[PDB]
Design a protein around this ligand. Sequence first.
Ligand SMILES: *Cc1c(COP(=O)(O)O)cnc(C)c1O
Ligand SMILES: *Cc1c(COP(=O)(O)O)cnc(C)c1O
Lengths: 374, 374
Amino acid sequence: MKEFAYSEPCLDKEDKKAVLEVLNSKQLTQGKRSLLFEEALCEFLGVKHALVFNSATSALLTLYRNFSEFSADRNEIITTPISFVATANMLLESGYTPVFAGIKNDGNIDELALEKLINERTKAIVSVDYAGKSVEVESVQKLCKKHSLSFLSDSSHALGSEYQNKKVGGFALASVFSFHAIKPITTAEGGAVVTNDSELHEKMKLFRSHGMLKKDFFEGEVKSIGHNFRLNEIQSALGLSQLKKAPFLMQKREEAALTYDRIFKDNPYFTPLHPLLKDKSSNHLYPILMHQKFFTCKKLILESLHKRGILAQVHYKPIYQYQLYQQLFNTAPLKSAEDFYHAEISLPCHANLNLESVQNIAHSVLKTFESFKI
Amino acid sequence: MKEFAYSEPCLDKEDKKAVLEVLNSKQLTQGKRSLLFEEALCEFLGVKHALVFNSATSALLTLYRNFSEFSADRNEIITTPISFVATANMLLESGYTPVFAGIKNDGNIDELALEKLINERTKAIVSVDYAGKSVEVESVQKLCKKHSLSFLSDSSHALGSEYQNKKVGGFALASVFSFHAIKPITTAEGGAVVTNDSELHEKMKLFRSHGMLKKDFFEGEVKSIGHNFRLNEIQSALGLSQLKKAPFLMQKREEAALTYDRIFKDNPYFTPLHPLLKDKSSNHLYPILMHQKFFTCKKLILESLHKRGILAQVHYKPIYQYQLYQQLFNTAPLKSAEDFYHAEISLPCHANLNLESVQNIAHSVLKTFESFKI
Ligand SMILES: *Cc1c(COP(=O)(O)O)cnc(C)c1O
Ligand SMILES: *Cc1c(COP(=O)(O)O)cnc(C)c1O
């Protein structure tokens, strides 16, 4: 064999050490470490508040449910069809109707194609930093200010990524990050909502934990519902430990990407996105875009790659194509999204991928594409 | 000092070892160990299906949401006011209106006071095994069969507890368990829904994880929404390890309880519930009930206890007393619930409490009560 998944977790002696001491403690959850992890996120991102969750999908639900109250008259939210289905499933769960915008070459939501989709039902815009590349923040901030819309950012891919030399996380009303096993850094399962809005932070904090407010050690008060989406102490210690070396892990991915770039440069088969970056990316993904000619035999290419141990993946199937979304709003397919979908392949890319591996992978990808003459 | 919390987690060399090997794995989530943990639950409980979640509150949401589809005409569910607010908050989140039944001496829902609360809107009955003592299963099973009602059980307290020499978990349409830090066994945060209904297991399974159905390694299908309430591999390993010694841990609590029983026997201040058991209990709590005379100075008693290092707690404030529930349905106070609330104190009780400690605690409790003459 010799099989490379598209991403994998990268833990070290430190991470493990960090988890041990927690197991020695009487305080396994709702303890000092999640608070520490939250503060460390704040300093890393330069934002004013941070909340950690069991998953980013819980984070998303919490944000959608709490950034404003729900009004049946302001029930539309614009977002991208190119993202993990979770971005939209949580919109549904919060009563909102997703309105799918066109995307651009780089997989990011098309900021120029947003305004025509706004009507008096439009409440918010939910962008996704695809592969860790920050969307056109300045452009969207303004569109929303102009139309009194809330700017929400699913930045699951992008912890560490920058826009105009400023870290992603601060730009939206709130931003979501993910610490799933295979994201930039991990807590096995995990997520976070950061924001500069204290009131929002507070509402979310409660929603995350039963809506319980304290009085004394013996009694509480509940003025509104909440769940249990808390991140426990074991995972928080892991997160803290992972975050400390976040820039290091990002750079490893960056170097892997540069190696891909050297070898793919000017190839006749596909176009890699990484070279086109203007700001630092978390490099959560290393996507390549096939030329139109290869579309109709994509499946065979993926299988060919998999036969070489390159467990490639596609991000993402346009969300509106899922049976549930068809069922609910027969959504007209979007040329930009459909094209990107058929074209995109994410190659193996994570902090533990060494020089030798990248080169073997990069050459196998080329050998594969060329085998399918014209 | 020398402070005893009312419960605490009990990990050992095994537990830790178990967590380590997972940290050495490339598979930190959605892996072999949660499946293993799920099977181990099935054998322990003798049920046919088990699903593990990030928390019991997520488990509860998932059950409530999926045991049937929601119909505005069958929107009422009967449950107890004596339980953790989570039991009811998730009912609200699933569109249901909680209908609060009276309880009995032992804190359990009064099976004799249930029938009169049923009308053509009633959909289900949600019982709680208070302190790990099984409710009157036979009686409820029948009431539901008779009125075509779904029997749901919040058995968070009761993993290991028995009813008529059969383990709790099998008796309802489904049952929820919790592995929060201080429950019978722990995964730091964690929960489970067990059931003998495959279709229900399947719907819940999907709801737990984005509603994603597989096609090949490259594509999925989504016919209905789902979240991320998955339990990761680290916690699953912990759960597995903990479950192996579950009966051992339960017996440790049993012994602690028996020691309390010896010393409290015939005391003139309060009545402990443990002696009154008819079946094995998980002994998640060791509750004592004060006589009416002490009610009006409960607060001072709790503080007095706390000054002695006995960090006692009350389970539970009647749910309908929470500002949110008052707000939504000005619920008339129930004498049984109100009485139990004012009376109940949970004393320290967990697998790591040794003979010496229990005796010191037991005598301190007595000293405390007697200090408040008449
Ligand atoms: C995977 C992902 C999420 C889901 O978050 P989890 O941590 O897996 O719960 C949300 N949005 C995007 C864009 C994702 O990549
Ligand atoms: C604690 C508890 C829950 C909530 O479970 P978590 O694991 O904390 O999410 C639900 N019901 C009862 C009876 C509980 O005691």
